Write an enzyme that holds these catalytic residues in place. Sequence first.
Site, mmCIF file in Angstrom:
data_model
loop_
_atom_site.group_PDB
_atom_site.id
_atom_site.type_symbol
_atom_site.label_atom_id
_atom_site.label_comp_id
_atom_site.label_asym_id
_atom_site.label_seq_id
_atom_site.Cartn_x
_atom_site.Cartn_y
_atom_site.Cartn_z
ATOM 1 N N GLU A 38 11.086 52.775 43.137
ATOM 2 C CA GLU A 38 10.811 51.429 42.742
ATOM 3 C C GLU A 38 10.285 51.401 41.332
ATOM 4 O O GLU A 38 9.482 52.268 40.923
ATOM 5 C CB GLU A 38 9.709 50.727 43.590
ATOM 6 C CG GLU A 38 10.057 50.671 45.068
ATOM 7 C CD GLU A 38 8.947 50.056 45.903
ATOM 8 O OE1 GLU A 38 8.006 49.439 45.383
ATOM 9 O OE2 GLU A 38 9.054 50.176 47.180
ATOM 10 N N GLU A 61 4.720 54.275 50.367
ATOM 11 C CA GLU A 61 3.508 54.301 49.487
ATOM 12 C C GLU A 61 2.317 54.666 50.355
ATOM 13 O O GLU A 61 1.396 53.841 50.483
ATOM 14 C CB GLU A 61 3.326 53.053 48.711
ATOM 15 C CG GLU A 61 4.434 52.742 47.729
ATOM 16 C CD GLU A 61 4.227 51.601 46.886
ATOM 17 O OE1 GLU A 61 3.343 50.719 47.237
ATOM 18 O OE2 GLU A 61 4.943 51.445 45.837
#
Length: 331
Positions: free
Chosen positions: A269, A146
Amino acid sequence: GNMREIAPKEFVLDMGAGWNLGNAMDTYNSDETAWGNPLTTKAMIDEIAKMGFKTLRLPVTWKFHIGEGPDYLIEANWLDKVEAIANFALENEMYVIINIHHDETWILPTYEKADEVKDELSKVWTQIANRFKTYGDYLIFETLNEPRHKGTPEEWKGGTQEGRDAVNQYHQVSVDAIRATGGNNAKRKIMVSTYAASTASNALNDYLVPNGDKNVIVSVHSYFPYQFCLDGTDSTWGTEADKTALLAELDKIRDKFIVEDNRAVVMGEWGSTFSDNPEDRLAHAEFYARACAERGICPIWWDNGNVDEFGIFNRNTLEWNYPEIAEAIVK
């Protein structure tokens, strides 16, 4: 050790559904048990595969195991641990994704830090890639989790232009490093994220695949809708408006990457935190996973081991806390 000639969209279909080994090797501590999960065993991974997950995502935080520049040597015994868990999965006939996870402190996406970050990233990826170079194409690298500027107003809103630019440069360094090691690494599938793994339109629009590399898969994360999934401020899910909003999210991702860009997507995710709401969590899991499967997107549930949060498998007893979530994802 075999590398197929296989296009990303068929590879992603073959990945099936996935499960994250969260809060394990990604733990942001020198001791990977510090976040409450035991040392990972094959017996654990065996249960993930028996439930029908085809893909293990193995997030790894490297910071506490990287030495000083300019070599940034990764501790051998840390690589050993990563490799061992990877092999637990591979022995189960699963795909395995290894990444760089909670490493933002040495990967800050600003022009000020870029030059040092790109130096370190090149050295770290070279090392990871060389450890794993002889593995076949069931092992997948994910260059950054991320990547974002933590603590900034745009952190979860697709970043600033500077941040997206830097993130693209860091993917460029990382892909290049992987491919330069050669062998199987010239062909291996690489998952490349948007800024923050965001689905924000600015992150979608500014995404660049290094070199147009044909073996790059897009990585995004979408805990949609966040009010239900992350914040716990809404505990119900399942109206037509809820369904429509989630399909619009997924259609945005499909339209940009799959249709416009001719790229495959792994939703590396997603999931929902426990909010005294088992029936709605289950309805949301069923619907999300189906919506991804209909679009050819591989869904990978985030499991942090903690039954009060995202944990659906009990690592200490080898039972499922929430087997029906798991089953809804893999069917």
